[PDB]
């Protein structure tokens, strides 16, 4: 068995190897990469996502989210308070302000220490989940707006034609902005490209050990657990690496820098934070190996997690028994 300790693997494809996306994913899995839940892909040195970022300031963040924390430093929830619209130029200036900017630090480890010590005492503003793309249309390799669609994968593997579309999302971050512990909708893959700015630190639990994280989360967030049988789908809960180590949960960490891709694999729980002003683009995707994870994915039926038009069809075809109750949650 390849990668039996479930370590995060890092790949350096040549420009020749960067032509066929599907084939490269299948290669990485042949080497055991999926066992970690997360992989890093460093693009060939010849590749570029676009020529410059010089003209992005006029993108609108229609609903910036203020991430307000509750709890203790290593075990907290966050709620998202909606703020007034602002441009990316306005948001970058805010991220660089004395109130919001990255503190002085020695290296990524000292910054990680400061994040876990102090996150709860601040409410950074996250421009998350913005439909759009920063890839130039002329970028032909690993262009997250040109991937094969999940609906087309389901049709190729299973023969069934379904409605829905699959488009990317932009994330504009600042110091302390946080992504809570989650897997993807329908336990899909994700791919995330850091277009510019400061780094993003990731934490991940190997898919084979995902239920260990769930059992810990039910113990740490006991009222949320009684409210919903899949409450990590609400994407609100944080648990620090120190608390994970104290409870014996297997995990890994890695820091992604500008110009790098990350792939998350089916049922790979992940969480993390931004080091400063940055912009990432991400999209979900599928392979043949995903289908079985999709059939088994948990679902939020309490009604909090409230998810896309395209997820309807996935539930309806892969989980027809749940269909019914899940759509009661989504209406
Ligand atoms: O970048 C972020 O805030 C969150 N991204 C993801 O969870 C992902 O790409 O799967
Ligand atoms: Mg612009
Ligand atoms: Ni994710
Ligand atoms: Zn729920």
- Domains for the chain: give ranges and CATH numbers: 1-331 (2.60.120.650)
Q: Binding site for Fe cation: what residues are annotated?
A: 182, 184, 270
Closest CA to 185 of 135, 134, 235: 235
**How many angstroms separate the alpha carbon of residue 64 from the centre of ligand 2?**
17
Please give the Cα distance from 329 to 165 (Å, whole number).
21
Please give the Cα distance from 88 to 109 (Å, whole number).
28
Contacts of 314 (CB under 8 A, 6+ apart): 150, 154, 162, 164, 185, 186, 294
Q: Which of 67, 78, 233, 280 to mutate to test the pocket of ligand 1 (most atoms within 8 A of CB)?
A: 280
Interaxial angle between packed helices 309-318 and 150-158, expressed in degrees from 0 to 180 and rounded to the nearest 10: 20
Whose CA is closest to atom 4 on ligand 1?
179
Write a three-state SS string for 160-198: CCCCCCCCCEEEEECCCCEEEEECCHHHCEEEEEEEEEC
183 lines ligand 1 (CB under 6 A): no
Bridge partner residues of 271 (DSSP):
203
Q: According to the entry, how was the structure determined?
A: X-ray
**How many angstroms separate the alpha carbon of residue 169 from the centre of ligand 2?**
16
- Tokens 């909090």 locate to 304
Radius of gyration of the chain (CA): 19
Rounded to an integer, what is the distance from CA 106 to the centroid of its chain? 27
Please give the Cα distance from 75 to 299 (Å, whole number).
23
248 burial level (CB within 10 Å; 0-12, 13-18, 19+): exposed
**Which ligand 1 atom is nearest residue 184's CA?**
10
Please give the Cα distance from 79 to 144 (Å, whole number).
29
Tokens matching residue 96: 């660089």
φ/ψ of 5, rounded to 5, equals: -90, 0
26 and 168 in contact (C-beta within 8 Å)? no
181 lines ligand 1 (CB under 6 A): no
Tokens matching residue 144: 């997250």
12 burial level (CB within 10 Å; 0-12, 13-18, 19+): exposed
Phi-psi region of 41 (alpha: psi -120 to 50; beta: other; left: phi over 0): beta
**Sign of CA pseudo-dihedral 252, 184, 199, 17:** positive
Q: Which of 175, 189, 192 to mutate to test the pocket of ligand 1 (most atoms within 8 A of CB)?
A: 192
**How many angstroms separate the alpha carbon of residue 134 from the centre of ligand 2?**
10
Largest CA distance in the chain: 55
Whose CA is closest to atom 9 on ligand 1?
192
- Tokens 């023969």 locate to 159
Ligand nearest to the CA of 67: 1
291 burial level (CB within 10 Å; 0-12, 13-18, 19+): middle
Please give the Cα distance from 273 to 173 (Å, whole number).
9
Tokens matching residue 47: 């590749």
Please give the Cα distance from 267 to 186 (Å, whole number).
9
Q: 71: helix, coil or strand? A: strand
φ/ψ of 323, rounded to 5, equals: -30, -85
Stated resolution in angstroms: 1.4
264 lines ligand 1 (CB under 6 A): yes
Please give the Cα distance from 112 to 67 (Å, whole number).
18
List b or e across 174-211, with b for residues whose CB sees 16 or more CB atoms inside 10 angstroms. bbbbbbbbbbbbbbbbbbbbbbbbbbbbbbbbbbebbe
Please give the Cα distance from 72 to 102 (Å, whole number).
21
Please give the Cα distance from 193 to 205 (Å, whole number).
20
115 lines ligand 1 (CB under 6 A): no
Separate counts of helices (H) and strands (E) for the chain: 10, 16
Bridge partner residues of 263 (DSSP):
39, 191
φ/ψ of 159, rounded to 5, equals: 80, 0
φ/ψ of 236, rounded to 5, equals: -125, -15
179 lines ligand 1 (CB under 6 A): yes
282 lines ligand 1 (CB under 6 A): yes
List b or e across 220-233, with b for residues whose CB sees 16 or more CB atoms inside 10 angstroms. bbeebbeebebbbb
């Amino acid at each position: 068995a390849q990668n039996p300790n479930c370590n995060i693997m890092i790949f350096h494809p040549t420009k020749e190897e960067f032509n066929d996306f599907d084939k490269y994913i299948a290669y990485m899995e042949s080497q055991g990469a999926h066992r970690a839940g997360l992989a890093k892909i460093i693009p060939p040195k010849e590749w570029k996502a676009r020529e410059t970022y010089d003209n992005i300031s006029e993108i609108l963040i229609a609903t910036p989210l203020q991430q307000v924390a509750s709890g203790r430093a290593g075990v907290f929830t966050q709620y998202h308070k909606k703020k007034k619209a602002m441009t990316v130029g306005e948001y970058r200036h805010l991220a660089n302000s004395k109130k919001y900017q990255t503190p002085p630090h020695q290296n990524f480890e000292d910054l990680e220490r400061k994040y876990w010590k102090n996150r709860i005492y601040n409410s950074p503003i996250y421009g998350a989940d913005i439909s759009g793309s920063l890839f130039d249309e002329n970028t032909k390799q690993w262009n997250l707006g040109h991937l094969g669609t999940i609906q087309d994968l389901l049709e190729k593997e299973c023969g069934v034609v379904i409605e829905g579309v699959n488009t990317p999302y932009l994330y504009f971050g600042m110091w302390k902005t946080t992504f809570a512990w989650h897997t993807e909708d329908m336990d899909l893959y994700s791919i995330n490209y850091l277009h510019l700015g400061e780094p993003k630190t990731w934490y991940v639990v190997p898919p084979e050990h995902g239920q260990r994280l769930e059992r810990l989360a039910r113990e740490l967030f006991p009222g949320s657990s009684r409210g919903c049988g899949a409450f990590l789908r609400h994407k609100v809960a944080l648990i620090s690496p120190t608390v994970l180590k104290e409870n014996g949960i297997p995990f890994n960490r890695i820091t992604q820098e500008a110009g790098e891709f990350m792939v998350t694999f089916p049922y790979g729980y992940h969480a993390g934070f931004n080091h400063g002003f940055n912009c990432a683009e991400a999209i979900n995707f599928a392979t043949p190996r995903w289908i079985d994870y999709g059939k088994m994915a948990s679902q939020c039926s309490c009604g909090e997690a409230r998810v896309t038009f395209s997820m309807d069809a996935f539930v309806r075809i892969l989980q027809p028994e749940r269909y019914d109750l899940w759509k009661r949650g989504q209406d």
